[model samples]
Target chain A: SGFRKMAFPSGKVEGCMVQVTCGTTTLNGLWLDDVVYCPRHVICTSEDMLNPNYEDLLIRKSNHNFLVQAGNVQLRVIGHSMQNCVLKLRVDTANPKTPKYKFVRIQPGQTFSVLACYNGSPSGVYQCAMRPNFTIKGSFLNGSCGSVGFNIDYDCVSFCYMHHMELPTGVHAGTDLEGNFYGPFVDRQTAQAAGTDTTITVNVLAWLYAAVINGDRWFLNRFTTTLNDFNLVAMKYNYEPLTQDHVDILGPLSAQTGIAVLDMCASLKELLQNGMNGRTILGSALLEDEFTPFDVVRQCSGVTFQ
Target chain B: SGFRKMAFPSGKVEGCMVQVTCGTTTLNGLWLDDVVYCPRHVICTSEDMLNPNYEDLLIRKSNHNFLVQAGNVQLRVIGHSMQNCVLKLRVDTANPKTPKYKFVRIQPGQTFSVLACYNGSPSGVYQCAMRPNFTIKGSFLNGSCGSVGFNIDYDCVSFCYMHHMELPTGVHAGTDLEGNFYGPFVDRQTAQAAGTDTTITVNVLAWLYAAVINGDRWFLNRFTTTLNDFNLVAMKYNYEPLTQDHVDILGPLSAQTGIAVLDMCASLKELLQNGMNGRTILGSALLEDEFTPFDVVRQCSGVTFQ
Candidate 1:
């Protein structure tokens, strides 16, 4: 293949306007590497990709926290946490591309959010994909225009991610997982508690119900704005009884201390059954390493999508 | 120069370890590109470069809103805005390498924040550099070392970036800069406001002291948590004098309408004197396009390190 293919505007090829009279163009199937050489490369793909300079991107996917918008475009969601993360998007709730990395990258209106991140997230803007790494030739267009598509307008937070914690002496302790920011772990001392801070606040809300049923959304927006704002500040717990490792990592709870209103949907489907045996509960640790294989994400909580 | 250069451990080259009894190694004048080979390449430069897996990164820079700390190490700061951005750090308050795009990449401790961004900020987690794009052979590092440095403990927020706005009727108006998420320009109607809502809230806090001296920190954290939270809610105004285009864009305000408490440090030094003439104030638009050099970053406010 002599690499000479650039003529778009088929079914889903929504935008292309090159004025290079000289030469260079490549949406390599769609602004993927962008070689479009200037009108500032259409002002850097109309102020950075998903064109019309800025339009509207809204995506909707349910069953594991969802959201997507494009006003001032920037809704990154791959593995969550950017505090109140833009437009709240969280995927990889076990193999939703937990193996191939989930993605989303936009530029419709702008100021975007609905974020989520991981694979040990440390910025790809809290992680996501499908765009950015742009290209834009000049004169006209050039090579690689195979099966192209991106009609975008993808359709599109919850509050209580977990509650009643504060027993650095009982629940996920080591001074409460170094005051909830878990890194190279040290003391859980098996989890240092002998009861009585009112039954270690009924076992730190049944081990923050497994740290908010394996938490994220930066520990569920810091447990819905600071330890449940103590509900407007003060604090709960004195019962204490569950353990079969809390009904086999949170399921059918009866012999318990408390927490039922659908014990966090079989506690996020028993950690999505060890990510349905491929083992993908994802990260953030402590809560006595939730169920081994990387603290099965301290048992993730915040359910009721019923 | 036929390849072969790797052996570090001088001043500032803090930590490096290689076990390629067979081959591979490099931190390249300090972990800037990295070339370690394996222990998982030291668990991938101890889980995504930065080192000792995680320690306590605490940098302290002054002037443009400062902060830096590490405990699960992730304090990225180059441009900004990751909402409540980890241990808050902001730069390019005008050429602090506003030329080479400032940087910060940590891991001495994690779960980081303290953000700031722009260069048409469209994400690199809002933007920054210094590290990330790692490499490793299998046994050790190789090829790169002409100067080594980075013992990093590097030094590093501010609240109040701008305020007293709400005059889409008088001040920044085209429906208040299309309700503050500025993208592709539109109408100002020259600065709407026929008067009374009390003199358009005293000239919309004097054109929001020039939209908080041409704003950022995502419009000073959305005007300090939503239009100065009216303190608890509901909302100021009347007057309107001062013009030489408001003393040639905010500075030494005597004929003013109000707003004094170091009238925003000569309004962030007369917009850093048109970015000290080399014109560097950057992206984000409409407080009447801040200063006409790509909306001189809407007159960026929040000062007092003096």
Candidate 2:
């Protein structure tokens, strides 16, 4: 991943400020460096830096903290400080060297809502960050120092992947096609002996009585009824039924894991439907095409966690 | 002349309220009467009058004075009060029995600008009136008393009307053909030699002489030049010149009044033009047709003061 670097240098060792830029776009106050080393990097060499003016950059550095939370469609930055400070928001797109959009001047003690989509850019993966500019009040302190910056780690793809596997096949015996090669080996002797034996015992009468139960048939009927019940439940909720198609796709796991997996899938679909209903009621329905299950699945499978 | 009347009867024989209406519009607070010596009028005998709420009519009698100044397009109502009072504005149009427009409610110690045009009516002659509703703050008061109202008198036609008289024709003697009507013939003058029938001769115009000074011609030329100069000044400012048309309409008075009148018109036009220039700079321009000189003159002439 490409990431842009920003350097801040000050005459004093502390309170050096630098802004991160991407191409033509610059994120305000994205990076603030207070620690100075040998051979200073004097970025703030503007005339106003020496003779400070009443611009926003001239404010005193105060004790402040900021938190950045990323979501699918919005970035929320929370600033916590007794003194009022300006919070700046920035978004990084495919080109890490240049931000797609950047904004600043969010008031302190307020949660700033930043829309993820920027400048007609598609609503997809983005890297967002926030920085707080504390007001410097002391006459001795000329610039910002002791400031904090925070960034959010967002991976939209890996967050929504579904795992699947193929089922195993069963093995069975096969039949051979030779014409009665050994079955009657005892026939000849038996015939000769049987001719004598048959002549002697041909009057023997065998009486056999047996009863068979249709257990396999009954079990298959019960299994089919249970599967149909599951299908009925899925259809009642307007979801795809757990049919042989699912079993085939699931392969050997159809019997044991198939029902449970399909049930979980249906339940998750119901839960999502309910959630969407709530979102509609709250006037925040997701975009139909952008949030399709296939799109979600693609995004989910697009990234892997290391 | 028709006028509408509103009667306010007071049990105390003082501070009776009455409205003067022209046609249907009730001039708001235009007439206030403190003398109550007339037959009893029950106009304000509504049940609310007894158990009065915060309605404007329930205020106690307070000594208030109001003055109304009428202009071409607006009415200025000035009210002086020792206490805070609610001022009511109303207008009566034709059919003095019904008010066309009525409005009441303005704060104390503020100059209220009332526009003359109301209710989408055509901008024509309107008889405007004003009445003040004084606020009564105490337990000892029941209804409005000691309130003053005033109305403005306007008749534009009479103001703009010009008096014209024909110049007198000279009277002289005349003669008929072959006959002379003499008023007391004194007898013919006779020749000195009537007795001796001698002829007498008379000689006239012997050595007559004349010389021209050209001073009057020079003065007349200078006067024509000065008049033309004034016309040029008027034309430079885009104003109609006071030419013979004005003299024809104004008759004998035009000569005596023409210079001053034309000068005033030219100056006024210049002032208005300068004002419009300022308005253009300020982004407020009047409609060209609605604010023409003819319209202004008509409106000014439509009002007559008694």
Candidate 3:
């Protein structure tokens, strides 16, 4: 009952791309049509089918498998599987002997955000794998095999930076160049080689602009104070004032694009000197313009121009 | 050397009031001249001279001695003494047998706000005492005795209510009718039975007025929402809407005394309906004339106006 009829060569199956086993029955490199399928039975998929070389593909396919999110100093694993699965995620550095392991259990379709930390080490290329096994109640049952593992060599540091970097409220990274959710890495070099630096810089600048021109006094105060502090620091260090340069840079950008960059800079300077007393000065300026944060970012990114 | 010379009784100290001892030295309370003698080391005042009956006086004088603040279900003991004083504060109820004890050590002039809970129980009349003993580091040592004990019969319920009740950020209860710091009761029945009911009412109403007129939308929203909820509950329970009745009651009182009660009522009602969106509607109304929360409360308390 476990074996299925096939129209291919004798004892061979169409789509016989992988080997799977159930209990004592082993199906080596058997296609889906040749493998006996039972809804409740556990099928162990072979590693050779995917191989270590196809690790990137495995990473892409299992992107949302463990439901883990990377943080500044921690990794959160969320279980999003039907069965209670013990997820053993390992972070391996260049030295294969020294690897960090994090274990977590996630109930069906639930997010377990915090899983582990990097112990305050510098970020670098790390090979991470997610191996999930069946569990009874919360404990793993003996003799139960796990699914085919997935692996990725990620830039853990960059992911941590991305996760921890504070953004003005409501601003977010859309997606990476790989069309993957912007988060912890699978390939540090490849990810770094991608075209996200400009995107990030443009996004940040746009957010700053919006915050200065339309955000609440609290946010406005924070940005203005930050810029003021930056200016002060720059002056103390005998460096050119960043805020002044920003004004000069944005002056022409604003004129060409019809954005009130000079007005924004003036308003910011005034707010920095006086205070953000919940006045509608910045809000009024925002009302006169039609450009959004996205539009500004796009223009800065060279994706759009006047 | 500890004793002072007086001109009154040859050798039979005329102004001898009490004797106090510290280690081997002794100081007797004596008058300066005939009935007046100044300058002394440490005087051993008699427990009987002040009398145990003057415990209330001791309580008043040593009100902040143990640095304990009253709450509904807890009391915080702040360390505010130079010498390491072993503070043994006991909360005695009517039962006398089931007294609750809260021990704390206060460093000189320190505010340890979070102390201990009341072991989870309803608020009621509680007899509390501050019995301080001397300690070296944290361990008890000999040769240091405490001053006369202070006792307060507090209404724990009222105290809990005071602790839990939300006030406008800056508003605070000044002091109780007994001139003791506002907290749980020493004499629940006596204090509650006193004129504080009207005083508290006036204070609350004054705070409400100020908050409605001058506070930000966040605070206004909280107050309005609370009042709205209170109004809803009152209406549901067949009680008069407190806010609505407050306006009517204030209206007559204001009319009789030539106070702008109608204006206040109208402003409050408008604020309640339109919501406090950071606009200074109430503040503007307040500035139009000149009435403070204190002034309004004083008028309500019959301390001013007709």
Candidate 4:
């Protein structure tokens, strides 16, 4: 698989190139190829991220061998979908009779962080997968060095939307995909049983869910209450009321592009009948080739103990 | 102090506001007030980071309680220095008799990521803190969700450099402090002892290291080889050879700002003479208030497992 890479026969520790397996004991990294993958990390300091490492720190003795002289070493990890997988690692930093191996792991739903000595709790989240899957992938070898030990990072997830651009390409129903095909799959395949109507399937519905909800409680509450789509959903995070940026992110394929305002107002009336659960009754589906959940593929690490 | 935020009793789980403690047993999260802090996490999908949550999600019961109905919930975490800390978490999602409690932890040296099915290893690093202390701080509360369990994320570190911008704002040797004071300190305070020259301390030396290295291997190698100064450091990451952007980032205080491209060249001659080891030797510094290592203040979580 293109996803797999091997250690070079000759090279120095340029980036976040770890041995995958370190000291003995529990210091062995397990490669979860599909779920977890190695990221392109590099040695650095806290302030060095923007100033990333452009040189090799360790010596690659061979494909599986490496040597480290000693100085402060760190790795910087980024853009990962931690929710869907787990990353395991083991380090073998030993000289002679010393304890030869070290191991560590990271997974979704968690983080390893530096404290806000001033303000305790945190107040934000980074959209690591803002791009697509393959776009933001990273590695642990590019971990960091804090007051503690070496740390691997970038525990993040991508946006969940309908990946319309890939297979469907040009068939979007009158509507513009804006980008990422974040809208309905109007011209997708074909209609089943009877009706002359050419509608979309579960993909659109799912995308609609992702779109309509748009990450805000206010919108979610409105959707749960009304169950109708009216150009709902935000285009940018924390942005409010609604503005041009909103359409830029989710405007429709037509008027909003130049069309709709109502003929234009985004709609999911039937989509909401799940709303019928009384008012919002709804049930839907439309299957395509592969279920493009998150975008692009990226790989990184796990965490230590919290 | 200011870090300890109470779960308000009147709010909804708008952001990544977890109940802090869920289900009991394994779900009771142990807050490492110093090491691990509660980040502002939220519930939403992946494609929503840039479009952050402007509304609340969960229902705050008491200052210490919360309520969750159903559907898929995800938390996104960000801007953390995971190397120096660990984030612990516990989730309680039991309608009846399930594993009421779920405990998860994330730490330094690890990550929970999404894989790049297309590409294998990653080739990037994100400088979470491009600004100074208290600038780019963030939390998990505004977290994101992926295909997996509600994932919490954004495990990244800030840049490490001297905090010259603060404390002393208007002091430089005929040079610009640039922005984050990513350079040297010429006219800090009084010079101690016998020498008539009012030289900066270890702080200057450390800044010199950060300034010189500037996150590129080419520059690092060059420095290790040359050891002398002549605008020897870079201002940006990955940018090389030396350009105006380099000057914008490093270009000494005086010359390049208006004076010398030669007086510039950037030096460490004496600095690198750590360089005398033959030619390039750097052993240096100046001291001041608290050592400003990485920038800003922030908190987040740990990963599941690798």
DockQ: which candidate is best? 4
lDDT of 3 by residue, A1-306 (tens): 000000001001111112222333222111121121111112223342222233332343331332221112122222211111111222221211112221222211111111011211110111111111111111111111121111111111011111111122211221111123233322121212112211112222333464443323343322323556545643443333445545554554455444454344334444445544444432232111222233333223312000
Residue-level lDDT tens digits of model 3 in B33-86: 112111111122334222233333334333133222111222222221111111
- Per residue, candidate 2 scores C-alpha lDDT tens digits across B1-306 of 000111111111111123222122222222222211111111123353243333343244221322221222232222222111223322122122221222222221111111111121111011111111111111101111112211212211111000010111111111111112112111122111111111000000000000001011110111222345556655664434455444243332223323333333333334334543323211113212112222122222222121
TM-score, model 4, chain B versus true chain B = 0.21
What is the TM-score (0 to 1) of candidate 3?
A: 0.19
- TM-score order of candidates, top first: 4, 3, 1, 2
lDDT, candidate 2, at B280? 22
Candidate 4: which stretches are off by over 4 Å? A1-306, B1-306
What DockQ does candidate 4 score? Answer: 0.02
All candidates' lDDT scores? 0.20, 0.20, 0.23, 0.21
Native-contact fraction for each model?
A: 0.00, 0.00, 0.00, 0.00
**Residue-wise lDDT of candidate 1 within B49-138, one digit each (tens)?**
323221122212222222221112222335322111111123322211111111333211111111111111100111111111111011
lDDT of 2 at A47: 53
* Residue B142 accuracy (lDDT) in model 4: 14
- Each candidate structure's count of clashing pairs: 104, 32, 25, 173
Error of 4 at A52 (Å): 31
Q: Name the regions of candidate 1 deviating beyond 4 angstroms.
A: A1-25, A28-263, A266-306, B1-306
